[PDB]
């Protein structure tokens, strides 16, 4: 599941979200593997990763759904 995703697997997933293709690199650069991905907050995405609210909302909502699947 998401918790075992590699750093490449998270970056690929983020690029698969609509309007989020540009953000694969920053996630890979910050070494966001699946375990770290599920710990992220919205503020982490918006402020620390410098991602706009639109794509941040799609990313964060995905985190929330994947955590809810555990």
From Swiss-Prot:
Residues 5-69 form the SAM domain. The lineage of its organism: Eukaryota, Metazoa, Chordata, Craniata, Vertebrata. The chain holds residues 705 to 773 of 780 of the full protein. It comes from the Eukaryota. Is a negative regulator of Notch target genes expression, required for RBPJ-mediated transcriptional repression. It recruits KDM1A to Notch-responsive elements and promotes KDM1A-mediated H3K4me demethylation. Involved in the regulation of ubiquitin-dependent degradation of a set of methylated non-histone proteins, including SOX2, DNMT1 and E2F1. It acts as an adapter recruiting the CRL4-DCAF5 E3 ubiquitin ligase complex to methylated target proteins. Required for normal maturation of myeloid progenitor cells. This is Lethal(3)malignant brain tumor-like protein 3. Coiled coil: none annotated. The gene is L3MBTL3. It is found in: Nucleus. Interacts with RNF2. Interacts (via SAM domain) with SAMD1 (via SAM domain); the interaction mediates L3MBTL3 binding to chromatin. Interacts with RBPJ; the interaction is required for L3MBTL3 localization to chromatin and is impaired by Notch-derived peptides containing the intracellular domain (NICD). Interacts (via SAM domain) with KDM1A. Interacts with DCAF5. Interacts with DNMT1. Interacts with E2F1. Interacts with SOX2. Interacts with SFMBT1.
């Amino acid at each position: 599941s998401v918790s075992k995703w590699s750093t490449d697997e998270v970056s690929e997933f983020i690029q698969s979200l609509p309007g989020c293709e540009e953000h694969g690199k920053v996630f890979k650069d910050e070494q966001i593997d699946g375990e770290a991905f599920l710990l992220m907050t919205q503020t982490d995405i918006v402020k620390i990763m410098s991602i706009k609210l639109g794509p941040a909302l799609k990313i964060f909502n995905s985190i929330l759904m994947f955590k809810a699947a555990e």
